[model samples]
Target: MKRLTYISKFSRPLSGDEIEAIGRISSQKNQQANVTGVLLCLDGIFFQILEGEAEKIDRIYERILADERHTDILCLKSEVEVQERMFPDWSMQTINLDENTDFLIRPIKVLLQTLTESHRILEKYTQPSIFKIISQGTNPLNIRPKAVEKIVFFSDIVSFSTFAEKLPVEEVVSVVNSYFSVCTAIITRQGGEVTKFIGDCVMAYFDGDCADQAIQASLDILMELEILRNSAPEGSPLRVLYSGIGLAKGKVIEGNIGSELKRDYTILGDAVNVAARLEALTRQLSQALVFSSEVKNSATKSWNFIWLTDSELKGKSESIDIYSIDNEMTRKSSGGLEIARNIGHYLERV
Candidate 1:
């Protein structure tokens, strides 16, 4: 039996053009090597299965990790022989993140609207598996369902409604888009999977492949936002904001979810819910960033945190302990003191 190798899995939202470029590059690199395999890109995650010589697969992965276009490369199954092939085609197929959001958000009406709009804007590429198998009468190996282990993180802009009240609708859209773009870039670079963007909010997940990596990404996001808030020019929307982040760690159902017509690849479970609640708690706590006990407990003990009191969550039975990212300079360090200060300074100067 020929061996089946799961070369790598990466979850992060990339533009259609980015995926195409990745495919073209991967094909060109492997073409001369006589490598044959499949690249599946869906949602913000890319799962590539390459089968050839073990040494060749290893070499290809090295090239992929070095490529600027790819991040969060994870090795799932290595040099294992199997009867089935998930994707057997022209090297790689990149799926759009929008497709995943379309499936996951269907349960949430508000999020659905936002994701649907985003999908339209991005115009993501649909996976060829369904078409190839159904229409072309080709039976590719079924996608083995793998349980997803991840630290789910959710971030929402503070005072979005209030800010929206102040700005024109067009400006509001532009501002939110800009903020999300910056934050998403930070998340994806860190190997985080961007699940979807709700109104004024972005949700992401970090799989078990690397826990420390995910935490570092979360920290980087906070730090990057800090810089943006402090450095933006006058009247910039980013100059007017801070974001609330919620993170929780646990097992999640990962893989394709949806009808035959349309499928979404995403993560689902209580961990995802906790992350959502964490984002909501930001307003009541009057803090910029709030994380659940699950996340804090999993984090490196050396990481800084200030514990807040337990609070009753909307959907949960027991009160949950919350911690705010505290700063000595400002009471609420993790949330947005620096950004708030910058905004104040900018307003005064203006």
Candidate 2:
């Protein structure tokens, strides 16, 4: 086995929620790579001790090196082969030195031994920062910022308030749950993350296959809506439900956006705001799906998109060009107006 160790200082202090996001995201990724270790956030420093394959550690290190939140990094150790592993079972045994120190001051005598006494590798390790880190963790070590490029997706059910006023609370909840279940399944299957479910709307994001996945998921969901509208049993509360979708793509700041008490690891920025506006616009424009020019531009040839308008959205300084899918492939057959009369919306096979 091999172990990798590193220490770095954060550019700024991280909130408790941001720290929570880091551990969850890290553990999920690490479990997939078969890596395990410990990470501590001290006054302003990050101490990471990794135990795993050399390649996997290197890969994770590279990702950290580029993290927007970390700076002044120093490699403490690398590729030191060993017979036994440390913290092998956990993806990463986390320590919030600011809160609990037991994980750092455990009975184990591996690196903690190096902290309190002289070690062969580096004599400079016997310092207050090192001692406090190994003894109590950091009480708290803070933030590492990461800026990522992703496609933002937003959607909601139409006229949800009317359903609430017209039906019993039990029936309304059942209808909403049924609609969300199928749509959430479609989003997940297409490699998208449904980050937040806002009342009757769901917000999501995607990377790499962003455009295709976003568009495909939206269409598949509308198709699902068609099924519900058609097959819903008579007198079912769901008969009143109508669905709409919207998507946009751009850079987003992803991290914890809430206070220490309640937190969310979600995306935000102009593109995300644009997506939300477009989703709301669907209700006004009477369209099943709507998207920004960025989304249409990134899509492949199979996507049949069209310009809907160049109107101003609610939260923007300038007017934005809006677009939507040519739902029925028979658009060109009557110069586009004929299909809307026969069938309101449809997802083309291609």
Candidate 3:
């Protein structure tokens, strides 16, 4: 129902035996309470995550604050009403980084180490669900693809080919990441999942019932891009950046696909293609945001959805009505610039 991750410095130096004993006792208690998580110690610091019912997690954290073993505890993440557990089978498993590593626990070790080293970089860049799926090891043979109706959202930078060709590799990477940071944050807030980024294109989706949210997110993305562009310096790629977004609602096949060595859990169907086609149409039509008639009908009637010309798509026989939304707003100093700066800081580290 809930998950909490926290890090703290040990009040005093803890010996290897003492830390292991604490972990053993915690496992016994956690199992009895139907709680599950991991406790990792590294560099004289304690990093622990607890997953269980919200009430149980709150009570346990209260006790943790009262304990004298660690000080300066900071809650790194708090997820409420979670549908699944990251460590379902791990009931207070202890990982002492100073000790020799095991084959089975190495992944968790590396993940936690990355978190401690550059917590924000991993938090901002990685998708939590994908991380869990990979770490949990999904068996392709057992998991079959399912057809689900969703509102697909696709976006791409305008004139990305020319920009990438003219700009240096480092500048192109920074511009793309800065744009992604803006879109990813808005999409997540609107309850959509960003599936992947292909060069300058962003592919994401939302539930079928989330037409209004999806549309609003698209508008917000364009507005934020304007803010970032205006804030960027004259020489930076972001100063002249712009993008086109498309939204469509239809059924898609969602599951794992690819070879044994390289696999991807993604969605594929007519809607995916339609969304991409609409995005490509944006540059030609000179519109910032575009969506199918289905999306326009499903969304709230408050915003003005201008009707654009219908055209025969590549795969479709009949032409579909296209609509665009206006997101004209003042562009001044905002958090978009901060995101660009923050991403630039981390890109150099890579």
Candidate 4:
């Protein structure tokens, strides 16, 4: 990744709305391109730090240099070489000078005086100084990145659109939070993480023997959700909520993705989409839980699985064999005996 810090002066004073407009546009563009950073605005000057792939940073900065609203934008001698990133998350957090107390000043005088008289802090300063600036703004440095095999899962409240269309916003939000709270507790207890929530659906992952985790987690979720449904006061929107889950196990690239001011640590790969497609299939097949053959096969002991037919999934050319489990996985090719013996061991009172 590359880090670029620049100090620029607006050609003219910008009103609050105008600065906000700049922030809005800058944040949108940076996020779409996987960049992240912080923007500090004050007294007609802009101190911005951006980090992303070397190529992406250059593309964004090239436009920044030419944007007519600002003039005399002095860039550092070169992009700072960094192993990771200073501002790890956020697409474009625009904080005015008065909003923070830690960032005492812009280091403007130091830079301006030195630029004319030479080096109070080099515009050509190193990564450490750039970090100091971000740290002062309360940004933490993060560079951790890794690839792992996981059971990527997705689940959604079935028929959620109707609720959105009919229920009051507050009621819908309340119902959604209730659903999430149930899922979050069960998932965390089972050693899984809900990476992000998309509308009424959840995008989540479980590392390691996750095939088992996914299976166990899905059962627990459905059980608790059913209990919630039964306990709901009759005729409540909560009574109308239904959910289905899908899981696919495979390797995924996990880490921070996005430019300055926008970043999220999440899994990304073919597996993610496959998991989503499988979840969508759950609604189609009218099954509460559905998974790919990948999940079925990855289990230490195969469980009983009913083939749900080979179906084409979005963005996939070949059809994938899908399966659903009514009980435990009890279908193993050569390991049938072992699978049967341990099938009950997969979950429940052992």
What is the full ranking by lDDT, best candidate first?
3, 4, 2, 1
lDDT of 2 at 107: 43
Find the number of clashing residue pairs for candidate 1: 8
Q: Model-by-model lDDT, in order?
A: 0.63, 0.69, 0.78, 0.71
Better of 3 and 4 by lDDT: 3
Give the candidate number with the greatest lDDT.
3
- Model 3 residue runs over 4 Å out of place are 1-38, 44-55, 58-127, 131-143, 327-350
Candidate 3 residues 1-350, lDDT tens each? 88888887789999989999999999999999889999989767798999999889889999998899898676766777588989998889998886857786677677767777686455445554464343233433356889998999999876566556676788788888898889989998989889889888999999888999998898788788878877977556776667778899898998877798765677898999999998888756667777999998988758787888787786759999998864443112222323333333333333
**Count of backbone clashes, every candidate in sequence:** 8, 11, 0, 21
Model 1 over residues 1-350: C-alpha lDDT tens digits? 12333322344456777677877877787677666676655444455667665567667666766865556444444543435555456555444444455755446544535554464444334332333233222222355457767888898776676566666677778778877877778887876767677788888887665555656666676677668777988667767667767777778887667688766566678888888887777666766667777677776646667887687755658988887555542243443533443353443333
Give, for candidate 4, the lowest lDDT window spanning 10 residues: 329-338
Off by over 4 Å in 2: 1-143, 314-316, 329-350
Better of 1 and 4 by lDDT: 4
RMSD of each: 11.8, 15.4, 8.7, 17.4
TM-score of each: 0.59, 0.55, 0.67, 0.53
Pairs of colliding residues, candidate 1 = 3-81, 11-45, 12-44, 41-95, 43-97, 85-141, 288-335, 289-335
